[model samples]
Target chain A: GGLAALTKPPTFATVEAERAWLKERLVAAIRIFANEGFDHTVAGHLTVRDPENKHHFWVNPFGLAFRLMTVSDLILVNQEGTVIGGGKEGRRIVNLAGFMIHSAIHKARPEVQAICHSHSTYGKAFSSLGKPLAITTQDSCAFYGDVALLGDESGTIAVALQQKKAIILQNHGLLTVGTTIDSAVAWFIMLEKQCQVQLLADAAGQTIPIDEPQAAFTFKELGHEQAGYFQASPYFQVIEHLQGEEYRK
Target chain B: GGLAALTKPPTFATVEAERAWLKERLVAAIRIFANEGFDHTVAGHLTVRDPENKHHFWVNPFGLAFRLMTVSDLILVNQEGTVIGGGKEGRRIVNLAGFMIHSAIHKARPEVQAICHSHSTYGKAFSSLGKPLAITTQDSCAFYGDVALLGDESGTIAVALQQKKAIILQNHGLLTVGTTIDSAVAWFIMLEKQCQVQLLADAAGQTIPIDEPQAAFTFKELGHEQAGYFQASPYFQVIEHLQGEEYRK
Candidate 1:
């Protein structure tokens, strides 16, 4: 099937159902990241907003390995970084750095329901360049003018997220936001792959960046919200088959 | 728990048992490649010589996806590129390009019992450089002076195979060989990761290549046969747990 046929985003009838669904997908996203080698120790985090409470978001608890996460392992956190649910007593310590980055985006971009952040190998390496992605290929063109690069200075990350769906944290890794967890995860995966492709093209020889007008056209065509949803469908199937009931705990 | 304890390679009493073991490991190696996103359509191939029949070797069938392959999906081919066993009737065909490269190496190097070749993304990109791997990091040092670059010219592959455990096929991908299937697969995996690392470091900034003396010493320490065997041990566990009994078919 083409992208159109696979682009249907999931919907829920009520806030409770939506929160439950988000938790399942959030857990699955963690497992997918683990399976794809995106996990570096417990250095990555993904979050989805609570449907009924916009100020609260659900995230993978601190110290749990991505591969071992389950729905019940997800922690509910408020805007103030307080853990309201999940995790063991006294051991429910949040990943402070992760929370800091994620909360800044979630609070700043309320329309973004989900956010994914990871220190993926390629992403981290590319971030050290302290520059935005070059439009080198069709895939790289997807981020041509949409991706942002943020320094460690105060308010830089929040400003980056104000307009872009993806951000390269200088000397760190990548962060992607979407209307849903699926699209956010897909953006993260694609951004990492593009980082790899750009690195390869740069290392081997001269790389031809796409022209400004053409890159903008390609970005509008391929970087849409529906495009991200379509790209993530197969990955969901992979997680379902490979992980079975593990992530649904 | 450590490399010393995990370094012991498998042993078999009879050639029949040895061949059976080789087939299983070979199948697992293919699955590992698949899981790691190494297989590109049907372009990659891995092979191990039959202990009882020097002229015959086992390989993946021409049209199967690496992720879905099993022991029963392996095909036996002779040095002349004829399929002698396995594969469905009338559908059994050898990849001529794969056969040519593998047969040349097998014919030239009697000590090499197994070989792996793939169009893995990073490897393909790195190969375009047509240069040897630099001694940039400890992991990359494993290939210092132990890898060769070869063109498609007649007998060039064999010449490269004679002195190096791995060869970067110019404008192609990677080829690796070992005394056992375990080590060959390890070298392929490690080499691919090193390709990724090198590309990343090169793209980011000036990567300091290790000094000649230190590079040579590290290569000896990490590039030994037993080191490769130990490196592949955890991968075997991954296959056993994730692939289960499917690959043993």
Candidate 2:
């Protein structure tokens, strides 16, 4: 019974409370990524689509460093990829490349509502690798034989998104998709992390793969539960805490 | 009244909520470490002890990858080094070596509720040099003059907890402490980032340190309220927005 409580315990709130909670979390995740030097030289975006309305999505406006995003600053964009309302305007426009990538993902994967694209260091390191990220560590397990290379092509992701859901575009950056804004965020977070580990494992002299059978087994056994919560909550909680101190004020 | 509202906020509904929130954050932090590939191959641990119950702590289960840790899967361990209750049991155990390192920090630094340790790529790269992570960018300023390299000959903190607190273990990785999990997580997150910047700067043929006066002034100015939030929130928000789905559920 005690273990059972721990197994599938319910949250402390209703849907509205949870949505509010999730929004606050999204804000914090952006801030943390920015602080950790993930957004290299700017020019990246984190976009989330509304599950019901494909046209309406949330994306960070361009030119603003991710570290500065607040709950209020997250802009909603229509299917036409126009900034719907509620965020910075003018020079703080959406990243054209980021928009292109998000647009393609939303159009292709109707189940995916969130997408993250960033020029993260380790992710870049992995993208440079001739092979896809291997399922070596638990973090890399998120990919677990699931990496879709965006090919060696460069420039905007308009063409790439048409072909792949998660792409580490050659010589550029990483892109990921999820069923919800949270899922997409978690996918990119874990994927980037896997890239970081792959780089480190490569540097550490000798490393072994998780074996095909094992990777395939865990890939199905663990399912979405593996790096799911680990990827999502930290960013959500941190963002909510900081935003509660400001925007909610 | 307005200033007071801005300064002093409302209390959470319950201590359980606080613990739940903190626990969520702890998982998020560990996931970031794992995803970013900041873990030691055979050493180090990430810990978050409850302020209420000094003995009870949230730790990455032994042998489980940091990136794979979920908020629910995060183990609650007592000070006696036994798993108290909750989380994945079989394959997701906390490494004893990691436990020992984290245990020392949690004991010595009562103010710290969460402590994260990693042999991060850039951090380890710079740790061998035995110098502070010099301020190169505004993102790197938080650690300017705040670093302390652990002296040589300690031999991996095998015996005695007091030996390891805030260390840049010679030829190894970096160790940092914080009053809360967020603070500690933030420190390590930034520390590795600083290393990345310095390494890149060096590769670019620039000097290791940022010029004296500018770095000094930036450090001093960062103490302001606005600057503090500015430096912290952006990174947290971006990551949260991107990874929300994975962590929260």
Candidate 3:
């Protein structure tokens, strides 16, 4: 499911509806990320896989920057690295690194409908550690026993297909996957947060790791079902309200 | 004067309006704390005391995690740690540690309407320092000289009541008190965030603490009448949105 749908637009009278929806999702994601202090400066990337085709994805075009990504400006690109649709500025805004990182996941993981990668300050620091993230907070429990580590790579997915889906890109950064754009983006968001917790836990030292039995209990208790609710929770309405016209489509 | 005024009965004609308004405040508080990353699992606490009675307070039930504390689950407790109000589970979910910690503050500081405490990763880290979280961010300016540090010892009021309104709790965690639960909660939220800023700032090796004069200036600006709008300001809306039900009565 990908760029094929964009090849044939529904007979909409104008670009307003489509543009508004895309911008809203992008803006909401940015606001949430920024509020978490993840989207500092112009760093971080999020991409939505095209639902109708397998080869294309929707990602912030080059120079668009996360805080400034708008629906109208998102570039639609194919597996081979060509803009299949979207806007004129899309051609110029295509971030090569953004495409390179996101494309590898979309190609290897059909279940991944969205992907987000960024230089989250804490996540980067934690990545320097050889250990995987610990389930320190309830939010961390969401990924309990689920996080996979990718050895340091050159940020490109030139590694084998299996290694491409989730990577720490040693000295580089994090990569995450999900079934929908929201789900995928949520994974990265939560992972970055987990990193923040780990670092702070390190600072607090002699901190107790959740006991194995308790960690397992919490892991089973929270699982994806609970996290799914928080991911699309109506609590996000505040985000929508703060976003206004700037986030449309 | 109590839950009757706060609940207003779900089916009552005004229920919708009442619910919406209360939900808005709860949402605001949730957003503020979440943004500040004050959320945690396993019995973190936030309380808003009734303006009418220093003895009455609103808090999360003992087992309910911070991120999951909705407008509905908030429980009411008295200074003596009795369940005075809210949700069927409120009676059973009482957090003893939360109650004892909150009770000490409510008993000692009659003017504080709100108090929030959490195992915030960063805040707890700073708490272990047994020193006040140093002023750094602009928000830090608000709490600059006003903060007090209480080392470990459960801070039961008998031991370290004279030191400060808020404490780092030595090896344990954080505690804070304010004239209103909203105010107290905001201070802790910002204090923990300030710790994060300091950790990251120090990580960069810049290691600059605000000069004594600047710290004094900011503290005076925040504490003086008409100069510090933190208590009733629009910025406080962020906190209200997350825990607005505190204003229900």
Best by TM-score: 3
Q: Can you rank all candidates by lDDT, best first?
A: 1, 2, 3
Candidate 3: list runs displaced more than 4 Å. Answer: A1-23, A30-44, A90-93, A153-167, A200-206, A221-238, B1-121, B124-249
lDDT of 3 by residue, A1-249 (tens): 121221122344544554445445655665556555676555667776665566877776655555545566676788767877775442445666567767766776676666777778877888787567765454455566666666552233534325322445455567766554444555666667567656764654434455566567656644453343234332244455555466564
lDDT string for model 1 (A62-153, tens) is: 88888898887788899879998876565576887778777887878888999998789999999999877866554555676788888753
* Top-scoring candidate (DockQ): 3
Off by over 4 Å in 2: A1-22, A89-92, A153-165, A203-206, A221-227, A239-244, A247-249, B1-249
Q: How are the candidates ranked when ordered by TM-score, highest leading? A: 3, 1, 2
Q: Please state the interface RMSD for every predicted structure, separated by commas.
A: 7.9, 9.7, 11.4
TM-score of chain A of 3: 0.78
Winner on TM-score between 1 and 3 is: 3
Better of 1 and 3 by lDDT: 1
| lDDT for position B174 in model 2 | 73
List of chain A TM-scores, every candidate: 0.94, 0.79, 0.78
DockQ of 3: 0.08
lDDT of 2 by residue, B57-156 (tens): 8876654455455677777788767777777545345555457666766666575566667767666655545455566787666655655665331223
What would the TM-score be for candidate 2 when compared with the true structure?
0.51
